[PDB]
Design a protein around this ligand. Structure first.
Ligand SMILES: *C/C=C(\C)c1ccc(-c2ccc(N(C)C)s2)cc1
Length: 133
C-alpha cells in the first residue's frame, strides 16, 4: 500500500545518533535527542503530503508533492540548503536531498499496521519502526 496516512508512534529506533553525527549535529543536541521517543504525523491526499516529526525536543514539518522537486532549508535540524525530491519506488516512499551531504534523505514504507523508516546520510543509516495510533 502507498497509503501512509496516520499518527505514528515510535516503537523502535536504531542508530539515530549515527545519522545525527553524519549531519554534524552538535554534541549537546545529539546526546539529548538520542534518548527521545518520536512521533511522525503524515497527512496524505494523493500526491500531496504534510509530514511532522516531533519529540519533546523538536517539531519539524515539511510539505511536498510526490514527483515535484523543491528547494528547502533544513531549519533546526542542520540549517542546510538542499534540493529535495520525493518519489515512489514501488510502495517505498523515497526522499533524496541533493546538497553537501552524500546519500542524504529518507525512505518510508508500510509493513502491516506499522510504518518503517530509514534516515540516511553519508554512510550512516538510522532504522525506525512506528505503530499506527
Ligand atoms: C518522512 C520523515 C521526515 C520528513 C523527517 C523525519 C525526521 C526529522 C527529524 C529528525 C530530528 C530532527 N530535529 C529537528 C532535531 S528532525 C525530520 C523530518
Amino acid at each position: 500500500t502507498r497509503d501512509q496516512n496516520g499518527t505514528w508512534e515510535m516503537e523502535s529506533n536504531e542508530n539515530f545518533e549515527g545519522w545525527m553525527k553524519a549531519l554534524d549535529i552538535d554534541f549537546a543536541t545529539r546526546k539529548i535527542a538520542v534518548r527521545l521517543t518520536q512521533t511522525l504525523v503524515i497527512d496524505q491526499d494523493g500526491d500531496n503530503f504534510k509530514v511532522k516529526s516531533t519529540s519533546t525536543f523538536w517539531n519539524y514539518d515539511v510539505d511536498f508533492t510526490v514527483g515535484v522537486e523543491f528547494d528547502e532549508y533544513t531549519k533546526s535540524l542542520d540549517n542546510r540548503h538542499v534540493k529535495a525530491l520525493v518519489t515512489w519506488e514501488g510502495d517505498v516512499l523515497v526522499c533524496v536531498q541533493k546538497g553537501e551531504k552524500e546519500n542524504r534523505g529518507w525512505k518510508k514504507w508500510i509493513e502491516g499496521d506499522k510504518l518503517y523508516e530509514e534516515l540516511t546520510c553519508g554512510d550512516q543509516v538510522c532504522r525506525q519502526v512506528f505503530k499506527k495510533k
